[PDB]
Swiss-Prot record:
PANTHER family: RAS, DI-RAS, AND RHEB FAMILY MEMBERS OF SMALL GTPASE SUPERFAMILY
CDD domains attached to this UniProt entry: H_N_K_Ras_like (cd04138)
Gene, per the UniProt record: KRAS
Effect on the protein upon substituting residue 34 to R: In CFC2; characterized by a defective GTPase-activating protein sensitivity and a strongly reduced interaction with effectors
Lineage start: Eukaryota, Metazoa, Chordata, Craniata, Vertebrata
Outcome when changing residue 19 to F: In OES; somatic mutation
UniProt-recorded name of the protein: GTPase KRas
In-chain residues carrying the UniProt-annotated modification N6-acetyllysine: 101
Amino acid sequence: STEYKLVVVGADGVGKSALTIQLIQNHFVDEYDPTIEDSYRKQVVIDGETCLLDILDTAGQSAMRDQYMRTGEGFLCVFAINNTKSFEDIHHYREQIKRVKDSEDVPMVLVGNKCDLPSRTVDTKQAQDLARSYGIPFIETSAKTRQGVDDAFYTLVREIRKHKEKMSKDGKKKKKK
Ligand SMILES: Nc1nc2c(ncn2[C@@H]2O[C@H](COP(=O)(O)OP(=O)(O)O)[C@@H](O)[C@H]2O)c(=O)[nH]1
Ligand SMILES: c1ccc2[nH]cnc2c1
Ligand SMILES: [Mg+2]
């Protein structure tokens, strides 16, 4: 019943596509194609509610980017736990989102992907601390094993819901419930 526009963002090679394909098709693509942008739809029930997920799997870091950022209601901000630059990139994606959507309050979830790998270069604590600073959830995932995949996406839907209710009551000006 309720539709949610989700946008998966992050540096090339962090597993944005693999995560999305795991959610939709339930298999791991060890393959690759970092250039194209796919979108997928999925009907799921979350907390007893029927959700239509419309997910954009981005490719890159323009007059295409701005539109999809305006369209998106929530953002899955993905880095890979063995890719320091991709973790650092999160700051820049967040700033870009807040600017395009002209808001300090945008539903987001921080996702640390590839947690199946050894010798991570980005510690769980540093990612947890960042998420705490932003006031957003942090979820660790492996698109390879499928661990945390549903949780990441469902958590983002829950964040969007909380924002919806927060907006109606706002901080001041109007109030509601
Ligand atoms: N070990 C491991 N490899 C992954 C994971 N997610 C993606 N990959 C691999 O990382 C490479 C890039 O993944 P891809 O989905 O194309 O990244 P994208 O550019 O962010 O969309 C591919 O070879 C994937 O098979 C993961 O969770 N664990
Ligand atoms: C943003 C979010 C989801 C989308 N699905 C198709 N285009 C999109 C843009
Ligand atoms: Mg991709």
